[PDB]
Each structure stands twice: as C-alpha cells, then as structure tokens.
C-alpha cells in the first residue's frame with residue numbers, strides 16, 4: 062500500500078529535508094572507514110512515503126505513549142540507514158530491523174547525524190561497501206537513507222562513550 | 224527485540240567523549256517510527 066511522491070527541489074519541504082541532511086554531517090572517529098570520506102552530499106531525490114496502514118499503526122502507538130507521558134509523545138525527526146530501507150518503506154519497521162549487537166541492546170536505532178546513519182547504508186560498519194565497486198567510500202553509487210518520524214516518549218538517558 | 228527499560232519508551236545514547244557528535248536513539252517497538260522521507264543521494268569527494 063505504499064506510494065512514493067517525488068518532491069520538487071523548489072518545494073519548501075524538499076529544501077528543509079535537504080538542509081537537515083546536509084547540516085548534520087560530521088566527521089567520524091573511524092576516519093571514514095564505515096561511511097566514506099565526505100563533508101556533504103549530492104541529493105538526487107527526496108520522496109514522501111505514503112502508506113495509510115503504516116501511518117495509522119504509527120499514530121495509534123503515538124497516542125498510547127502520549128497518554129502514558131502527560132500527553133507528550135516526544136516526537137522527533139531522525140535518520141535511519143540500512144540495507145533494508147526498501148522493505149521498511151513497504152512493510153514498516155519491525156523486529157527484523159533491530160540491531161542485535163547495538164550499544165543499547167536489540168532495538169531499532171536512529172541518529173541525529175545523517176552521517177551516522179550513512180555508516181549503516183551498506184550494512185553494520187559499512188559492510189563491504191557498495192554492491193558494484195565494493196567501496197565503503199563510493200562516490201558513484203546511489204545511496205538511500207530514511208528521515209523518520211519517531212516517538213520517544215519517556216526516554217532513558219544513557220551517557221555513552223561514543 | 225529487547226524491551227525498553229521499565230517505565231521508559233526509548234533509550235537516548237548521549238555522546239560523552241566526542242564533543243561534536245549528536246545523539247542516537249533506540250526504540251523497541253516498530254510502531255514507534257514512521258519512515259516519512261526516502262532520500263536518494265551520493266556522498267561528495269572533498270575538493
């Protein structure tokens with residue numbers, strides 16, 4: 062039930078999503094090992110993901126959380142990178158998208174830094190890089206990230222050596 | 224999938240060491256996120 066609507070680069074929505082992508086790039090402690098060496102992106106396309114079933118699933122859970130947290134969903138817009146972004150946009154997030162080995166246990170991970178999510182587009186630690194050239198720093202191959210609406214509710218604060 | 228810490232709906236991983244890093248977040252229910260934008264891009268080689 063998913064349809065993808067292309068945004069025009071002239072559309073304020075395209076522009077605000079691009080600015081969040083570009084402005085949240087940082088340098089990584091791996092020197093670019095996982096995600097590649099870059100300071101910025103070439104955005105090729107931004108599509109709005111439209112799925113009624115999945116949206117309703119989200120808003121139902123958001124109301125549950127909000128009601129458990131003084132009417133505050135604590136909703137954020139965050140990035141998610143994965144080799145399985147095509148499954149996610151069609152079938153939603155679920156336990157198959159959980160990072161079993163993550164620092165905070167087997168959950169679904171999101172980032173403020175788009176460049177953190179970029180480290181996961183080709184797999185954990187960048188996998189073996191792009192399928193075509195086997196290059197984690199490929200400048201040719203098209204990559205995809207999700208920019209996601211995420212309900213945090215009451216969030217457990219972990220101070221972390223990152 | 225694991226569970227949220229009791230009395231919580233998510234976890235926030237706050238960077239200690241790296242002063243320039245932003246936060247990361249973990250949810251334990253797939254229904255707590257909606258994939259709103261699909262962004263297709265290349266990384267750019269620094270000049």
Ligand SMILES: CCc1cc2c(N)cccc2c(=O)[nH]1
Pocket residue numbers: 140141142143159160163170171172177178179181185247248
């Ligand atoms: C397992 C794919 C993944 C992991 C991840 C993480 N561990 C921290 C912040 C963001 C991400 C992400 O986007 N994808």
Ligand SMILES: [Zn+2]
Pocket residue numbers: 191192193194195196199200201202
């Ligand atoms: Zn490539």
